[PDB]
Amino acid sequence: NLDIIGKRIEKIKQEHETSWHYDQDHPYKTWAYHGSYETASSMVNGVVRLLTKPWDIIPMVTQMAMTKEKVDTRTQEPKEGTKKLMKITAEWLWKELGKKKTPRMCTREEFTRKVRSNAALGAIKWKSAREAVEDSGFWELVDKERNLHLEGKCETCVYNMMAIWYMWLGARFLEFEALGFLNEDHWFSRENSLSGVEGEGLHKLGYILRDVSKKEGGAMYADDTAGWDTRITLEDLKNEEMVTNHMEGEHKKLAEAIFKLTYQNKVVRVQRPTTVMDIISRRDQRGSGQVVTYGLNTFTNMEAQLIRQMEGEGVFKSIQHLTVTEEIAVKNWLVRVGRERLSRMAISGDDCVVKPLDDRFASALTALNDMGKVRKDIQQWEPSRGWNDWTQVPFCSHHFHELIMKDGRVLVVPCRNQDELIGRARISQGAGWSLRETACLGKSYAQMWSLMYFHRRDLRLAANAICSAVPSHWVPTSRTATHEWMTTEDMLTVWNRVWIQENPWMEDKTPVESWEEIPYLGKREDQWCGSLIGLTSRATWAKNIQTAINQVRSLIGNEEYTDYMPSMKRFRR
């Protein structure tokens, strides 16, 4: 307890001893309270909204721009059989993930390059992050903390809740130095992990699900856990910590301290309107950096789903206790079929798709519920609803269509309801956006639509309009998946590289010569997925699109523009 968190608590108190009140009205039940002390809406993208006028009267789009009691829950201890299944499975999984990879420290050099390239390091004397890393003063702060971690102690690694937990850059760097290798060296790639998809773009994911569908077995299951991060047990944190068993020297001690001090024993500051800063502490739940959180969520989800598969296949009879011969059976299953079973899955952090050996999986719920990974929007003991067609499975907020080109070649394309796509592109995060920076964010969305959602009539038209309205040489940006659309290269050349040249599922490498060779969904399928084709509002928009393009060009001013509309049949004279 305070033997590990006390110093951080003392430092904060001393910096506010002029306001330190132990409020007895404090709401926290499951978070430990220590004391208090005296102490960001969405903006509309005008370039995208002016070029999507028909959506101005669709509430599912317009209401997206307008505007915890789950974290203060507790997770019961799993049973002895459950804790044994998890320990055996976790030990085996870190060894498999580590067969072709070497754990290693990430460096000041690597960390500084990431900060000077703008990435959500989730950080809070110095203005921007770029100021700290260019100041030898900061690194002495990092050194002090670092030598403290080697000492087995922590002073400044404190979470700030807003459910994203920001930390100071120094604490982030240290986290990155010890555990960044998981992401930087692609431990959760489909190559290294078999069930992972780390570094797979949206253009990959449908082909991966179609490959899982080719396996013999039951339905495809895609059960979402309710508030996954709140359901991470101290047992899960212990099993994740076993990656340090694969490390040596300094690195091992440094990683052991991140897990011990900042993951298994957290200090958090939360804003309460009642304005008193509450310094609360808890040992369980996930609160790490987003990138580390993604890799460890993928790890613990892969472990949980292999255990659900073992339950369905009858590898163990009861979670209450594993017999000695059940342990050797579990071990032997992993060694014998573990890799083949990992391949029957697609796992992206807390999101999974599983094609088990058969449908006994649907009612194999005792380990899943006892690990605390309770399914969303279904009764605790009701059997899972499976999907019979890989094209109807949800994954990473998408579904996937099989689309046949006029020349016979097969595209597997990502898709989601079109209101969600338009509504997101109409939103910008942050202050001080110039008109040029707003235009370049609109161009980023347009180019993403050309590459990923070209098969949606409305998005190919709106993408071409936005690209026509923004000066041709202005570079797409985003302050906030492999992002092939972030480029000033011709989008037809990028489309060819992504969908033909580099696509391992396309045997014929004949390049496409024009956008007219690139197909759409069926007209009726496009409407099912939210297209406005067939409405009067949409027909007037499409017919008059040059007038909308010219409105935005007039606002931006005398610049160099390209007309992309004649790349579409209906504007080709």
Ligand SMILES: CC(=O)Nc1ccc(Nc2ccccc2)cc1
């Ligand atoms: C390029 C292209 O195919 N555009 C297109 C196709 C059909 C409609 N209209 C419509 C749709 C579905 C059902 C009844 C009418 C409008 C535009």
Ligand SMILES: [Cl-]
């Ligand atoms: Cl189905």
Ligand SMILES: [Zn+2]
């Ligand atoms: Zn620390």
Ligand SMILES: [Zn+2]
């Ligand atoms: Zn669709």
